[PDB]
Amino acid sequence: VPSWPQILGRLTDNRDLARGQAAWAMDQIMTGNARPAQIAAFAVAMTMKAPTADEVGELAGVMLSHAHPLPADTVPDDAVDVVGTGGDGVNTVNLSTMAAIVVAAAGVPVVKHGNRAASSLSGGADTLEALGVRIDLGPDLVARSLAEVGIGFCFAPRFHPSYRHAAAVRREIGVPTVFNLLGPLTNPARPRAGLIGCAFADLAEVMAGVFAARRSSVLVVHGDDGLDELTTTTTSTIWRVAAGSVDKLTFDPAGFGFARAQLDQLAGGDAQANAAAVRAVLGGARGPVRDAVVLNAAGAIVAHAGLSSRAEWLPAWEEGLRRASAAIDTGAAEQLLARWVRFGRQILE
Amino acid sequence: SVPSWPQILGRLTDNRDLARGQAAWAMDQIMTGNARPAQIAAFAVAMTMKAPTADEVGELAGVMLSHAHPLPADTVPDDAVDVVGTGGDGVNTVNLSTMAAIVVAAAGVPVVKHGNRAASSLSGGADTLEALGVRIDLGPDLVARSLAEVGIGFCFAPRFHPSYRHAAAVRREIGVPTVFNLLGPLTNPARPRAGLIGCAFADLAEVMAGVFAARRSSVLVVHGDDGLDELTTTTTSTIWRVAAGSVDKLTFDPAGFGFARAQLDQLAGGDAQANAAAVRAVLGGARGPVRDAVVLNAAGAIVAHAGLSSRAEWLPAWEEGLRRASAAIDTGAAEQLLARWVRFGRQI
């Protein structure tokens, strides 16, 4: 007999839910049957109890069942995502977006999930728009983009219309909850690999567990400086997901020859400013922004390799970094962005 | 800084006590209709799971009182008493507080009871009073008249706390008990200085006591060790005795006064008509477990009242309370007082 008092009562007692209860809650939420107060109570109670991977897996699985899918046979078997929770409160250039472009230019199909900024000045989606990339595409056109360009972008509001009740509650309460994990977990193209950033150190393990239950090849990452990206300012924590199991590691880019950068060297601005930062890096400019992009691109490439994993860790990273650097320095990344802008401009005719 | 929902909710979800004034800010937003239902719910739940402090709950109740309809000046005696609990004990008993309150008034102590309809039980104190023919819908002036002419008044919470309607609605939508469930007993709009106050939630009783301590009330905050938000007859109770700005926690055992141990099912209630029939039976002199529980709680309230003009010590105060409560039933005074109260309400 599932109900709000039962489920909320269990969470406020600090108990894990019974199997199916989180799914019931998410069903209510996604059908418009949960009142805002119920949505908010659930989000908060789940957060303070401390969600489990099974619970979050139920939320994401129900959410995905309401999402628009891409057409059959349009997503390569080895597609990767590069995306994080956001919410790190540091306001950097768009590292996941830049890395995605480089990764795609290295020959790895990228189907990227994303959204506008929530607290930062310019999110991935905003910066893409400033670059001339069409972010508003439906399933058929993202699929075509992936085939013709090597990359596609699923704009979350376009693909998850039924999440609008939850999204509004998220904005009303302001505080991060378990719902902040759902974007990265609900890419509607379901790529099987990814580099997934998590701003909340205490939730990164749960997100890893959800990918492990899917048998995805993923690195869930949290910079030890608070970034929802692999950082160059210090070490990072990586939850490596492979063969359905999770493995926690401390990662140090110094071991690959990266100098320690400062956070302000990665600082972003508005969409225009961040668009110019993308153009600078793809044009081959050296410096801390390139270093961070290359590092994160390599991470995604390593996750992709893990789909066919012989893959010793250190060699995988070495080849990842080399591939990312070549993708920029051959001009391929700059050319890929231009091809992507061109594709969007062809849609009119 | 400037207060905001993200700041306050963030602090609670980080498991931190709020800064002084933050709970009051939140409660004022809620009471003025400025908070969204999602914000109200997040706050209620986050405060509950953090574990609210006495200072925070005092801010909530104090803000809530500032928006209530007061009784007119000089109409509540200095030594008026309340008998009321959080409810939510999940046992669905007869209306023990309400019966006790009638008995207490009939013993000659002024009573101004705060109450409400049932939330999760079949018949709450207001429902039962209504079924008895007592008027539950009176405003400030007529409650004051009831108190002067009958020696008892009932403040119906929705009538005295209109601005609580947004919080009340959220409470009903989410169902789960929260810190808001403490607020009824803490916000009697007549502000009596004594009380027997039941708490269904063992972990929060102390918090409720802390709030009363900062008011210089004389209050017994009680939790039956079987879970009742009343002094129980089935086992011991925990009492947080509040007076002179301090709290004296103790374990209470009515077997020390010769009460036989009862079973919870012997105190079981029903619908409004059934619970009204139980009131009439007790007030008519019927002996048994229900009477015993009524007499115990009535004495408890009389003890709280004695703690105002505090001549008497704990034990003798209890012995006198039990005598007065028993006598109020056996001499017909309680039955007579209820008839008088019903009469008052019908004379407009």
Ligand SMILES: O=P(O)(O)OC[C@H]1O[C@H](OP(=O)(O)OP(=O)(O)O)[C@H](O)[C@@H]1O
């Ligand atoms: O405003 P915030 O809550 O801080 O979030 C900043 C951005 O990070 C996330 O995207 P993603 O990782 O795709 O973009 P990036 O290129 O900015 O890393 C999120 O969807 C936002 O676009």
Ligand SMILES: O=P(O)(O)OC[C@H]1O[C@H](OP(=O)(O)OP(=O)(O)O)[C@H](O)[C@@H]1O
């Ligand atoms: O439905 P529940 O949430 O369980 O609450 C039952 C009753 O308990 C409280 O009252 P009070 O102590 O005034 O009344 P009673 O003890 O006479 O029932 C509350 O105002 C309800 O009327």
Ligand SMILES: Nc1cccc(F)c1C(=O)O
């Ligand atoms: N912000 C959102 C993210 C994913 C899906 C959505 F419908 C929204 C939204 O409605 O704003």
Ligand SMILES: Nc1cccc(F)c1C(=O)O
């Ligand atoms: N942070 C996100 C990443 C991918 C998709 C999304 F909807 C979001 C989001 O939090 O809005």
Ligand SMILES: Nc1cccc(F)c1C(=O)O
């Ligand atoms: N249920 C209530 C309790 C106290 C004050 C109120 F306004 C209500 C209500 O609106 O239902």
Ligand SMILES: Nc1cccc(F)c1C(=O)O
């Ligand atoms: N439980 C209560 C006690 C006194 C006044 C009230 F409004 C309530 C209530 O919870 O509604």
Ligand SMILES: [Mg+2]
């Ligand atoms: Mg990112």
Ligand SMILES: [Mg+2]
């Ligand atoms: Mg980031």
Ligand SMILES: [Mg+2]
């Ligand atoms: Mg009671």
Ligand SMILES: [Mg+2]
């Ligand atoms: Mg009770």
